[PDB]
Design a protein around this ligand. Structure first.
Ligand SMILES: Nc1ncnc2c1ncn2[C@@H]1O[C@H](COP(=O)(O)OP(=O)(O)O)[C@@H](O)[C@H]1O
Ligand SMILES: Nc1ncnc2c1ncn2[C@@H]1O[C@H](COP(=O)(O)OP(=O)(O)O)[C@@H](O)[C@H]1O
Ligand code: BEF
Ligand code: BEF
Ligand SMILES: [Mg+2]
Ligand SMILES: [Mg+2]
Lengths: 417, 417
RNA sequence: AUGUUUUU
């Protein structure tokens, strides 16, 4: 008796099971209400019920166990967590809790937690003694997260160009700067697919705030990982809540020496949401940005770091420029002094239908020698010195024509000499 | 005895009928008052009266049935809908209701609804069980909505250029960016005529907010569809109300697997209206735009989506640029990074009296391979690569001179090779 | 109202 197991079951089988259990007509009923009635009827027989979810401690002291399939939205099937157990096990926002639950009695509206069985997918004896995320020693990117497929596919050209322009390692904090209508969607899809193919052990999390739902359901059915999104039909409060829950879960996972990867596509939208939810202080800067509005996105971005004791946190955010709004322009670069990695995309190259439209000149990675060998770094330096004199479109055409001849970049580097 | 039937009748015949029924002199009376008196006299004999309209639920709990011929304006002949029936049939704003009505008794001012016969042009048993619009899975444009006439007319050149620049499919969410005095009116008229000619099965709705009455009555007598407009003589409150009613009706139609097409021509004017009706919060951004003013137009724009279960919602809005106001430059923009189709028009080409004055270079459609075949996409790519080096005016002249030689674009593509 | 917008 698990909550996620009943959530994954279809509607027809749940209706059939409820009709066999002998309850009210479930055809004219919601799936969540059907599951609730089935759990009630199964607990009336004396059997136990189990559930799971991410903890969201409220300001009063209690909390609930949000579900991932609903993008951490307030649902009727949330498991109530008393503050006594929180104080007894030192629980915090983001801790994954899995234990026995019971249906609400007369006068209650949510399931109660009796005994916790597993904390953060581990024993509670290992979670009671742990080092906080704020005390971990940061470090630079040491492990190399190669994005090249290696299967010789035609779509691998984007990953090869990305590796030649800006290699990505564990704990990297980069930025994907690109004007609208440049190809950010396809680039993010390719990055997510390459991460899921090359490094399936890492925890991939794609955050899409204030996006077109069709794109949400497309990304959810395309990438092999977790997708937490919030369409534009929701207020900025839900955006802030989702961002906080995601970053808290990422911190709790990193605290257990896990490799978390966050592919953010709405850093600008997140900053707009934070500027909308912040109370007015009577002081407005140039472009309509509050003085204390960028602090929360600043911390959300800076949360990414590489841990020496174990694990890492990678955050790749895509910033929006040339959107016609001065607020986004002020945000983007305020954040430019940030992202230890900038991958610029050119609109002029995208208009020529030359995919990918990557600005190789302005791209780059700091401390790239820690992720590449000596000969590889020398070859990349020679390639950059050869590409720099040529124009952007000409350099992109040259790179595409030279990478189409071979499958691996090593052969291209060997033929360049 | 139908309301719309009496509304379509002329004034002279209604006056004659009222004089034959033996009532007060109807020559010095309004047509609506004449219809009201005729309905009263006909109901005094014991016969039944029927009406219809779009439901507009008020904040208190009751509602009225607005009429389409009055642009959903508050009229004396609105049918009152009690909240009891709303609670009994789960009615919402936008549901088309058609049932028996009765004249108001002593102390009443509006017609009452006794029994509902048809809901959303369908049986109530099919409307009681339905999936909300917020739960439908979005998708990209799959079905091709070809705009080419095919009759070899001289006006078909605009549709041919539009198809070669940006093909339109079901569920598309585009933008027509053009400075003033460019030819937006003729272009919108041609688009509406091509939609009514090629795809007469789709529900066409043209929304004109804050425009001149002459243009309104011109569009109403030119296109073959529904025209809901609101001239500048009305406050922004009526603009917001009309936009809400139109989008709610569109959502209710899409919920019944219908293909709705909305040709918006005032996205900038709608954003200005929303910025005017929003209460001041003491925080003004660059250009005079409120922080929470663009949220409602953002949702109105993002409502457009393609449904996998059935139906679609297409919204083609025309944004205004270079109007001398910085608010529109932020308002029209901020919207640039939202849609997935931009059809730019050049003022320099319009000054040369070269119609249509379309910027073929900056135009385009994302995921265009889902609406065109392989050979068609290759021919469009070759045409774009040939047109790109030439200047805007030169490319437009070349395209016009090459399309004037033949009737179909297939012959042009075959002759280009 | 200052900042924002004006504004480069
Ligand atoms: N690698 C690519 N190959 C082919 N087309 C692409 C590629 N990247 C982008 N595009 C085209 O650009 C359009 C928009 O790209 P997108 O990633 O949505 O840009 P952004 O996210 O910056 O708005 C897509 O619909 C696609 O047709
Ligand atoms: N396809 C066309 N053919 C001929 N003249 C046109 C065409 N499109 C626009 N025009 C001219 O431009 C004028 C204004 O066009 P309009 O569509 O009103 O531009 P906008 O809507 O951008 O203000 C029209 O009065 C018309 O004379
Ligand atoms: F319009 Be893109 F997604 F920035
Ligand atoms: F003056 Be146009 F209608 F934009
Ligand atoms: Mg995008
Ligand atoms: Mg116009």
């Amino acid at each position: 008796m698990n909550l996620t197991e009943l959530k994954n079951t279809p509607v027809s089988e749940l209706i059939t099971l409820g009709e066999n259990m002998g309850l009210e007509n479930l055809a004219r009923m919601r799936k969540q209400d059907i599951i609730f009635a089935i759990l009630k009827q199964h607990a009336k027989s004396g059997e136990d019920i189990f559930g799971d979810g991410v903890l969201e401690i409220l300001q009063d002291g209690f909390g609930f166990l949000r579900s991932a399939d609903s993008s951490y939205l307030a649902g009727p099937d949330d498991i109530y967590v008393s503050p006594s157990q929180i104080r007894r096990f030192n629980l915090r926002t983001g801790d994954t809790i899995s234990g026995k639950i019971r249906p609400p009695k007369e006068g209650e509206r949510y399931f109660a937690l009796l005994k916790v069985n597993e904390v953060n997918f581990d024993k509670p004896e290992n979670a009671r003694n742990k080092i906080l995320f704020e005390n971990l020693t940061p470090l630079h990117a040491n492990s190399r997260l190669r994005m090249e497929r290696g299967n010789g596919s035609t779509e691998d050209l984007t990953a090869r160009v990305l590796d030649l322009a800006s290699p990505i390692g564990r704990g990297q904090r980069g930025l994907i700067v690109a004007p609208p209508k440049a190809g950010k969607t396809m680039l993010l899809q390719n990055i997510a697919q390459s991460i899921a193919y090359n490094h399936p052990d890492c925890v991939l999390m794609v955050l899409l705030i204030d996006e077109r739902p069709e794109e949400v359901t497309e990304m959810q059915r395309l990438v092999k990982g977790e997708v937490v999104a919030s369409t534009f039909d929701e207020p900025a409060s839900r955006h802030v809540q989702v961002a906080e829950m995601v970053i808290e879960k990422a911190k709790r996972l990193v605290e257990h020496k896990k490799d978390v990867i966050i592919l953010l596509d709405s850093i600008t939208r997140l900053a707009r949401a934070y500027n909308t939810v912040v109370p007015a202080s009577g002081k407005v800067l140039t472009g309509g940005v509050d003085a204390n509005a960028l602090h929360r996105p600043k911390r959300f971005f800076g949360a990414a770091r590489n841990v020496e004791e174990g694990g890492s946190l990678t955050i790749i955010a895509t910033a929006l420029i040339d959107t016609g709004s001065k607020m986004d322009e002020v945000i983007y670069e305020e954040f430019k002094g940030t992202g230890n990695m900038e991958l610029h995309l050119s609109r002029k190259i995208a208009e020529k239908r030359v995919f990918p439209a990557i600005d190789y000149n302005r791209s780059g990675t700091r401390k790239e020698e820690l992720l590449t060998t000596q000969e590889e770094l020398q070859k990349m330096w020679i390639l950059r010195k050869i590409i720099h004199p040529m124009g952007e479109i000409d350099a992109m055409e040259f790179l595409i024509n030279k990478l189409a001849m071979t499958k691996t970049n090593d052969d291209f580097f060997e033929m360049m000499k």
